[model samples]
Target: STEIRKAIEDAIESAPVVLFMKGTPEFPKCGFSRATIGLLGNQGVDPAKFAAYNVLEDPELREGIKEFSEWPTIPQLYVNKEFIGGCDVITSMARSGELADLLEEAQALVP
Candidate 1:
C-alpha cells in the first residue's frame, strides 16, 4: 500500500494533468474514457500531451489508484497533481466554462 502511494506520489507530482483511463486517449476502451478524452480536448487540454495511464494494462495500478484516490471510479482526472474528479465533474466544469477559463490562464502563463 505504501509502495503504491509512493508510486502515486511520484507519478502525480511529476505531471500537470494525469488521466487514469481504460485505454489511451487515441483509442479509449470505455465510454467514460472516450468522453473524458473529448472533454479534455474541448477544454483545450491535449490529453495525449498530458500523462494518460491505461489502467486496463495494469491491474495492480488500477486498484492501487482507486485506493490512493479514495474515488471508486476509473477515468479519474488529476490536475496540477491533485485529484480533480471524474468525467462528470470535468464535463460540468467544461460546460460552465470554468475549466476553459483555467486553461486560458495556464496557457497565458506558459508559452
Candidate 2:
C-alpha cells in the first residue's frame, strides 16, 4: 500500500505534469478520462511528453493515489509537481485558457 503510495508521490514530485487517469491517453476507459486526454491534446501537449498513470492498471494505485492527493477523483492533474485538480477543474481551465498561463508560470508549459 505504502509502496504504491510512495511511487505515486515520487512520480508527481519528479514530473512537471502528471496525469492520473483510468486509462492511457490513447485509450481512456472512462468519458471523464477521455475528456482529460482531449484537454491535454488541445493544450498542445505532446502525447509522450507528460507522465500519465492509468489507475485501472493497478487497484492499489487507483485508491492509493486518491488518498495521496486528497483528491476523490481519478484523472487528477498536477502542474509543476503541485496538485491542480480533476476533470471539472481542468475543463474549466482549458476553456478559459488559464491552464496555459499557470503552466507557463510554473515553467511547465508544454511545448
Candidate 3:
C-alpha cells in the first residue's frame, strides 16, 4: 500500500529500528548502502530491523526520506525509530562499540 510508505516514514522514528535503504537488503544500490547493511548485520539487527525504501524505485521517497532523517541520503538508518545517523555515523558507532548501547536502549539486543 502507498500508505505504508508514509506510515513507515512516520513510524520509522518511533520504531525500535528502521532502515531506509536502496534496493532492499537483497539488492543494495551503493557501496555506502552495502556497508550500512553490513553494519546492521554485524550489530545483530534482526530481520525486522528496518523499513526498506528503494530510492531508485520511488523518486519521491528518495527525496522525502531526507525529511525523515538527519541524513540526506538513501540507506538511511534509524534506531529506536528515530534518526540516529547515516552510514558514516553507524560505522563510527559500530567501531566505537556504541551502537550496542543504542540497541540495548531499544531492547533490540539479543542478550
Candidate 4:
C-alpha cells in the first residue's frame, strides 16, 4: 500500500503537469479523460512537461491514487505537485482562465 502511495508520489513529482487518468493522452478510455486532455491542450500545456499515468494499467494505482489524493476519482490533475482537481474543477478553472494563469505561472505551458 505504501509502495503504491510512494509510486503515486514519485509520479506527481515526476513532471510539472501530471495527470492520473483512465488511459494515455493519445488514447483515453473514458470521455472524462478525453475531455481533461483536451482542456490541457487548449490551455497550451506542453507535452514535454506533462506526464500522464494510466490508472487503468495498474489496479493498485487505480485505487491507491484515490486514497493518496483523497479525491476519489480518476483523471486527477496535479500541477507542480499540487492537487489541481478533477474534470469539473478543471472545466470551471478553464472557463475562468484560472487554469491558464496557473499553468503559465508554473511555467508549464508551451511557448
Cα lDDT, all candidates? 0.77, 0.81, 0.71, 0.91
Question: After superposition on all CA atoms, what RMSD does each candidate show versus the true structure?
Answer: 2.5, 1.8, 3.1, 0.9
Ranking of candidates on TM-score, top first: 4, 2, 1, 3
Q: Across residues 1-111, which tens digit of lDDT does each residue of candidate 4 receive?
A: 779978988999999999999989888885899889988998999988999999987999998888888889778999999999988898999999999999999999998
Clashes of 3: 1
Candidate 3 worst ten-residue window by lDDT: 46-55
Assess every candidate by TM-score: 0.83, 0.86, 0.79, 0.95
Name model 1 segments beyond 4 Å from true. 46-49, 108-111
Please provide, for model 2 over 1-111, each residue's C-alpha lDDT reduced to its tens digit, 9 standing for 90 to 100: 768867987888766788999989778876898888877877776444478888887888888888888889888998767788988899998888889887667665456
Best by lDDT: 4
Residue 59, candidate 2: alpha-carbon lDDT:
85
- State each candidate's clash count: 0, 0, 1, 0
- Collision count of model 1: 0
Off by over 4 Å in 3: 1-15
Q: Scored by Cα lDDT, where does model 2 land?
A: 0.81
Q: What C-alpha root-mean-square deviation, in Å, does candidate 4 show against the real structure? A: 0.9
Candidate 3 per-residue lDDT, tens place, 70-104, comes to 46766677776567787778888888988978887
Top of the candidates by TM-score: 4
Q: Residue-wise lDDT of candidate 1 within 1-111, one digit each (tens)?
A: 778778777767656777889989778985889888877876667533377888888888889999888887888887777788877887788789877776665551233
